[PDB]
Amino acid sequence: DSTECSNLLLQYGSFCTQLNRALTGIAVEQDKNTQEVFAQVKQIYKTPPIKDFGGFNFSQILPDPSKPSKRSFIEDLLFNKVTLLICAQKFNGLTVLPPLLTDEMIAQYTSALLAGTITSGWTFGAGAALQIPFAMQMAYRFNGIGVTQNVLYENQKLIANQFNSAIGKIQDSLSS
Amino acid sequence: YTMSLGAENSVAYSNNSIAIPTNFTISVTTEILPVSMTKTSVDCTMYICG
Amino acid sequence: FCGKGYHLMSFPQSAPHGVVFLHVTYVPAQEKNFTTAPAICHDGKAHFPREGVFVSNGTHWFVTQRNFYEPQIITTDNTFVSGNCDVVIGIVNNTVYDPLQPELD
Amino acid sequence: LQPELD
Ligand SMILES: *[C@@H]1O[C@H](CO)[C@@H](O[C@@H]2O[C@H](CO)[C@@H](O)[C@H](O)[C@H]2NC(C)=O)[C@H](O)[C@H]1NC(C)=O
Numbered sequence: 373d374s375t376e377c378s379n380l381l382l383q384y385g386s387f388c389t390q391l392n393r394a395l396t397g398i399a400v401e402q403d404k405n406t407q408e409v410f411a412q413v414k415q416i417y418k419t420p421p422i423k424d425f426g427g428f429n430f431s432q433i434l435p436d437p438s439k440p441s442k443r444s445f446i447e448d449l450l451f452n453k454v455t456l457l458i459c460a461q462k463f464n465g466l467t468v469l470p471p472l473l474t475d476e477m478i479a480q481y482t483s484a485l486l487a488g489t490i491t492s493g494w495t496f497g498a499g500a501a502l503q504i505p506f507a508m509q510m511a512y513r514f515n516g517i518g519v520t521q522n523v524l525y526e527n528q529k530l531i532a533n534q535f536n537s538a539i540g541k542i543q544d545s546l547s548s
Numbered sequence: 549y550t551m552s553l554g555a556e557n558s559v560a561y562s563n564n565s566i567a568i569p570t571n572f573t574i575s576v577t578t579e580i581l582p583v584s585m586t587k588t589s590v591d592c593t594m595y596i597c598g
Numbered sequence: 599f600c601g602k603g604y605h606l607m608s609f610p611q612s613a614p615h616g617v618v619f620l621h622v623t624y625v626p627a628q629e630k631n632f633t634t635a636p637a638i639c640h641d642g643k644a645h646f647p648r649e650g651v652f653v654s655n656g657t658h659w660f661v662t663q664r665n666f667y668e669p670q671i672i673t674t675d676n677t678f679v680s681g682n683c684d685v686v687i688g689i690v691n692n693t694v695y696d697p698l699q700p701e702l703d
Numbered sequence: 704l705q706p707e708l709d
Pocket residue numbers: 570571572
């Protein structure tokens with residue numbers, strides 16, 4: 373608050389203007405990073421009420437639909453597994469400025485993408501989203517990695533088991 | 549106002565139902581990139597000193 | 599990466615410090631709502647599409663390209679066998695045409 | 704195929 377200092381300081385540029393350019397940089401990054409999750413779905417796709425996803429019990433990666441926090445269970449873990457004085461920082465003269473988007477908004481988009489992918493063929497990335505049974509959608513992926521698409525269906529239960537188990541092991545592992 | 553995230557809807561998923569496109573349109577679209585700044589230089593004995 | 603939607607090609611155009619890319623990309627537009635069978639069951643042989651997806655308007659099943667509706671009759675020439683129908687989750691019974699038979703004269 | 708043609 374020193375007046376006399378504030379007079380002596382009348383000799384230089386207001387260089388924290390340039391800091392603010394980084395800050396909006398960060399904000400547009402925070403958009404850009406997930407514009408595919410955001411902008412490339414201007415359609416906010418909801419998950420369907422149906423859950424007949426070929427036996428692939430991926431429930432825990434969806435938003436927890438009952439909860440106020442619309443995060444996934446796993447997202448809720450992740451949010452807690454990060455170890456998340458600011459009021460002193462403020463009065464000392466240093467100020468955080470809040471995110472442009474809340475984690476609820478962000479998680480709503482993440483939900484939108486989980487939904488789009490599972491509900492629909494990847495043409496939703498081309499905007500012309502199309503429904504498709506999830507099994508078919510995976511069979512094309514196998515053909516994409518040069519495995520003949522009969523092999524998925526011939527073993528679909530085994531894949532679904534393996535998948536569910538692996539997701540299991542992940543969220544177990546995310547306990548530490 | 550509290551901004552809207554987008555347009556809410558849902559894809560009509562079902563364990564048997566496909567959609568396939570019919571008529572199509574060629575998008576033409578522009579993407580833009582910078583390739584150089586302007587080249588500059590500073591003799592200290594002009595800038596720092598006259 | 600090269601524009602949005604399925605990329606065909608791009609052209610450069612110069613700019614005072616940069617480049618403009620015109621991207622030519624395919625976008626599918628109008629569409630339909632149908633049932634897809636995961637595979638077709640024939641005389642015990644499962645059949646699978648050599649390239650596409652099985653679709654139906656309800657009267658009959660047709661195999662089509664993935665990205666533009668253009669049905670053709672499901673046949674040996676365009677489907678391949680892979681073991682018995684019983685293994686598939688939800689296979690559907692149909693004929694498979696085969697072109698050979700008019701040649702048997 | 705020849706077995707088929709017979
Ligand atoms: C795809 O869409 C285009 C655009 O509507 C169709 O072209 C139209 O065809 C009608 C009848 O020939 C004309 O009256 C319109 O003027 C055309 N519009 C334009 C801008 O070309 C085209 O026929 C459609 N094709 C199919 C088979 O879907």
